[PDB]
Fold this sequence. Notes:
5 chains; A: Rossmann fold; four-stranded parallel β-sheet; globular; binds magnesium ion; Beta-tubulin_BS (chain A); flagellum (chain A); cytoplasm (chain A); Tubulin beta-4B chain (chain A)
Amino acid sequence: MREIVHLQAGQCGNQIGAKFWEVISDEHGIDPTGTYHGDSDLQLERINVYYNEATGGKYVPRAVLVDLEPGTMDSVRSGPFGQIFRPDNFVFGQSGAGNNWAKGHYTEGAELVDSVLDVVRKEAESCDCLQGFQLTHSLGGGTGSGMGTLLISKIREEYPDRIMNTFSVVPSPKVSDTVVEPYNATLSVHQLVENTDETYCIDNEALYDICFRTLKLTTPTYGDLNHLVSATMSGVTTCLRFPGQLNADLRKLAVNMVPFPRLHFFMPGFAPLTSRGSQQYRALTVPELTQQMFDAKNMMAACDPRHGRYLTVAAVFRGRMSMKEVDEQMLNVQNKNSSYFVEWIPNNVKTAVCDIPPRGLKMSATFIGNSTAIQELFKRISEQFTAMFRRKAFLHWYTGEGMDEMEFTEAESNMNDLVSEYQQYQ
Amino acid sequence: MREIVHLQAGQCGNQIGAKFWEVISDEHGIDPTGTYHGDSDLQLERINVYYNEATGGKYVPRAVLVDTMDSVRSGPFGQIFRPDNFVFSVLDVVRKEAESCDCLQGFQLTHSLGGGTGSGMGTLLISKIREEYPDRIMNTFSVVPSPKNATLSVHQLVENTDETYCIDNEALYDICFRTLKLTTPTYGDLNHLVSATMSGVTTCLRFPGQLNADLRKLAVNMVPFPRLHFFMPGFAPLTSRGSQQYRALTVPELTQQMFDAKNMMAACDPRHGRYLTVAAVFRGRMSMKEVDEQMLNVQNKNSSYFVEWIPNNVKTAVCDIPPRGLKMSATFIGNSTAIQELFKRISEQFTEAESNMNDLVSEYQQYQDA
Amino acid sequence: LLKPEDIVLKEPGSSEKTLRTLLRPSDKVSNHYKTTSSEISAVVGACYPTYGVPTIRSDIPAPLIRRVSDRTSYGEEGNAYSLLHPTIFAQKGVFERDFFKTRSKQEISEILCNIGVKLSEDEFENVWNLASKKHHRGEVCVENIRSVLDEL
Amino acid sequence: AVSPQSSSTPSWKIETKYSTRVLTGNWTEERRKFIKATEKTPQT
Amino acid sequence: MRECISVHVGQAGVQIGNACWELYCLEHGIQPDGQMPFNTFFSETGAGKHVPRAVFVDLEPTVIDEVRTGTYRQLFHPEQLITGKEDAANNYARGHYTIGKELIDLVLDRIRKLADQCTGLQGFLIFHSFGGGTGSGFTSLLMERLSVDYGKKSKLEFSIYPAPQVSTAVVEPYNSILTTHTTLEHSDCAFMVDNEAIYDICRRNLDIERPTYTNLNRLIGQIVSSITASLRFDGALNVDLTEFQTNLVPYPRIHFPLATYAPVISAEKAYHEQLSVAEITNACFEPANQMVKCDPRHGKYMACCLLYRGDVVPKDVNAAIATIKTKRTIQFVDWCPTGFKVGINYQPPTVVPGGDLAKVQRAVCMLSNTTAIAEAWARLDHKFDLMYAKRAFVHWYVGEGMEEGEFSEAREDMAALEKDYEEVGMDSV
Ligand SMILES: Nc1nc2c(ncn2[C@@H]2O[C@H](COP(=O)(O)OP(=O)(O)OP(=O)(O)O)[C@@H](O)[C@H]2O)c(=O)[nH]1
Ligand SMILES: Nc1nc2c(ncn2[C@@H]2O[C@H](COP(=O)(O)OP(=O)(O)O)[C@@H](O)[C@H]2O)c(=O)[nH]1
Ligand SMILES: Nc1nc2c(ncn2[C@@H]2O[C@H](COP(=O)(O)OP(=O)(O)O)[C@@H](O)[C@H]2O)c(=O)[nH]1
Ligand SMILES: [Mg+2]
């Protein structure tokens, strides 16, 4: 009735989202061969949010899985859940994406209209209702900031009214993979401002940090690193999908958290995190989740939230919960920490409730935060741009496929003007 | 958490350290090809002290052989070693293992004080390690010549190590003829007995005992003033093929043979000796009123001979894990006045080094006096 | 041709499988190298007779006629509340040993028709049976007979 | 302001690694296998 | 809800802490894993578990590691089991200055995390000794960092006093006299035990030859359970934990009292002869049953605190107290005509299974502040004088930061402590 369309693109987005369509599988109790097995009939009445129907009770996801390689669709079908995904919506590219945002965005710009746009309008019009559009691209690669981020300006050209919600993977300098990350990620955050209202930020050092300080596992793979985000993405729609006490949705999370049309870069979190050895020794109640919620070590974008005042702060909740103390510790943390919130805005906290706890838990509280220290993410990726631009060193890959020098200067000439707004209202 | 780097320097040290590694490997249950045997869970808990492991159940020591080596590898347990550090460079290998180590405490160097390899290269290499790790303890087991070269050697060593063990083959021979009735002293038997005396004091570093005292604590307890550090070992429950069924085994019985004069490692005279510090390290499952009562009872039998102007002239240690075979065992170690006779003979046998030896003899004299 | 047991690879749980390592002969040190710190201390929360005297001395029988010198307790002197507000039995001198004493069948039969209660013979047999079932050892007592007659 | 840490949480410095039988740094949390158990979806 | 924090620090306090949490768990229905098929010592989590309030901090790795592999591993929080890297080597400047300074930020949060969980907290139960670099120096780190934070709160430490005639340490009296340098400022009840008397109590009453250390941890275990019964079990005459700082210490540096526990007996002697109330308190005062090496006949008792337990009647207590205070042998002090103090509870003496004790109906715990321990301070600075004259063993304490400027400063402070058994012992007119 309020169906959600998820656009998974890239070598990232087909291995990040490959964990995202697993917690949607068990919280609705979906078998990996299509049919539902369970007893409680609360979770098949709102099955249509994520699962279309066919004959024989079979539920396939509304899914888009695109890449310019054939590389990663030989891996998402190679997982445990590969039979669940739809057969036609793997949209192939026989060639390679090849690290550059030049190949996907302008050379493969005319290719994506036959590729992704003709599958979306086939699908998203066919639903009995719609809510919004949610895409997960890697900023530092070739398909995500190639095919995917042009589509963020393509469907938004068709339907202006809906809501864009990008769980975006911005890289960090400490854990690095490619040396030209000022050349694929800086060239996409200029496009995100006009065309994506709800813009999250995911890092790769803070995610290992959470599996070091908190879960204490010593050799974390990507699969353990991708459930701390796959719990987040499933845990934000906990009121569009289940009953409860105080339901919220993706307009009710954007009115509270976006005061200005360009002050809209959020950052995430996830409350109930405790180690592998002390499971039962911690009492998961209200005042301990909200003590995990606010500190610097828990928050998934690799920034220190103390240098910058939160303009606005959101939340969500689940589980059989008593409202009073939930609404009470968030009376304290605005009041005791008046230094780390702005003045001139009376309220800064939003809360929303559900009824069902997640699988194997009792409570949960996903965190979404608009702070004015996301400019720490966007000063370091412009600190290294013009310190590399002056030798022009890796430019000779970009004048040979169809973009000029003159659009390179404008992408950072508005990057500071983003930061010139966060700094003024600090 | 204590750590150990073991270096065999000079020939006699090489063949005694070989028996050292054989003794610790049989006490820890490793097949000489390197595979682990896990009959009990206490064997592998602190193998990190002396070893680092390999892929597939193989283990390999933290030992460097520097100076014979083909004979050692041809011997019983040669296959455990690392063939890349058989140096004959030493600085590079000692920082390699000491940089792969986490928190360092002490070093086991096997040498002598009577020859051209165990003495000069020993003093050089102790200088070359004390210049690199000035916060560790160098347990440098040593062999000195019989009173019936060292003056060149010792006068940097007494500054550096303070954990040497110097009485020798004449005492070893007379132990073998009298208290064992052992007809043919082979060199390997003396290597065996010295090696077990090594392994006796390395159980507070590897096993959870009862009164747990590591090497730095042993240093603080034993050494009063920074130049009186040459110590006297001995291993108690030794007897023959016959006398076992005639003797009994108790803590008062092993006290007798850890303070037996014919048992200690010394061709010396406790009747002319005065122990500043004694430690008796016990291994086994033994009641401790027996230990403490027998401790101060055998101190009560001799008021003159244990040192005056010190109230507690003794110290006991005990671990919960005995040797192989024997239900309980003891190892006695002392710091007496019964040791300057060797210095007097080796000095009556450059010139500033001789003067420093006369200084150390006068140091014993002026501290034995009232 | 293989054994049915193949172990995990570490003290960590759910490790990948590995074979059981063989402990060679005369190299089993498990039976000899047991620990001594916590191994002697095994007190599981999942037995012996009791020594001394009780402060009430109910285990010894009470003497019939007391000596003057007797200061040893026997429990017959009740609470001060039971001396300050006594039952009428205590008010005129019949007490709990006269309740709990073993009377006779003819004594209870004389008690029945003279205490103001008219009882059938079968009802009297049932009352004696219920009193003997109520008493653990089994006899006729005034408290047991009155309690069984009140309950049934 | 920094917040306190125990022994061997981050491992951003490079350490040698042992099998967890040997009582070494960060032994216990990898000795214990992570445990979870559920019965069904509750009601509202 | 009169809770206390029960740290076990050093080696000489943790095997008792093995035996301490045996005796609390067997007393109630709590299993070793903490599942009950208590609120003073135990925090309860709603899954079905109970968690004790005890942090086991020591520098020595193996004695904590033998618990995490032990049979009580499913009891504690496994972040309370705190270990550093290298031992303190019985060196004060290693257990308080160079390795002990690394672990004090962690354990300031850990006493704060437990106390934020507790409701009606009434103090601390630290368990240390008087000889350790990590047992006597390091407990004076965990003491001065709490009175700057918690301040006025009742601290009860059970500290193995260095015996007159036996010992095992060597450089012990250099920092024992430094332990008392600050625990006079910030300790309010520092109970003490010599083990030498318990070596001979077993030899006379208990039919024991060859006793281990595992037997002495149980008898020290009972005294802790005797003083902590009035928090978990309501009685006729309660004694709570702020009352111990007005009963006992008369002048603010006389807070070092003894302890014993009278009917230690085996199963063949207790069957033969009875145990009234008027003879287990007679067995308290006899010189063959105090657990600390001392002869009380040369000492005048200042303030006993008889803790009874089990099946006792309060007229039987006061019948016995006037028989004893008329005795011509045992002497008192004239300006304390009050003297004694009772405590009667309805919970019996417990027994450990597999032990040597018998099932006695009554058992007492007298906790006598006495005079006679002053002459045991005559020997603890006589021992200090001789080593310090020739500067013997100083070459290592100066190794890790300490100097000579404090060793004489502590000796006069332990000289001034011996004087304060003479301004108060010489009676007014
Ligand atoms: N009650 C009891 N006392 C013990 C035990 N083990 C040792 N001790 C006592 O501890 C004394 C010496 O220990 P400490 O002075 O406390 O030294 P420490 O605290 O252990 O410091 P470290 O040895 O470095 O760990 C000895 O004289 C023993 O009397 C035990 O298991 N139980
Ligand atoms: N932490 C984490 N990082 C990922 C994951 N997948 C991709 N990345 C990051 O994404 C970058 C690689 O981009 P890539 O996927 O090859 O770009 P694409 O070819 O356009 O899809 C690298 O910096 C990786 O660190 C993941 O599952 N976890
Ligand atoms: N255990 C053992 N000791 C030996 C053997 N050969 C010599 N020694 C000892 O080595 C000592 C002399 O060697 P040393 O002076 O060090 O000559 P170097 O080895 O060339 O430096 C003698 O006192 C012997 O006790 C042997 O085969 N086995
Ligand atoms: Mg210790």
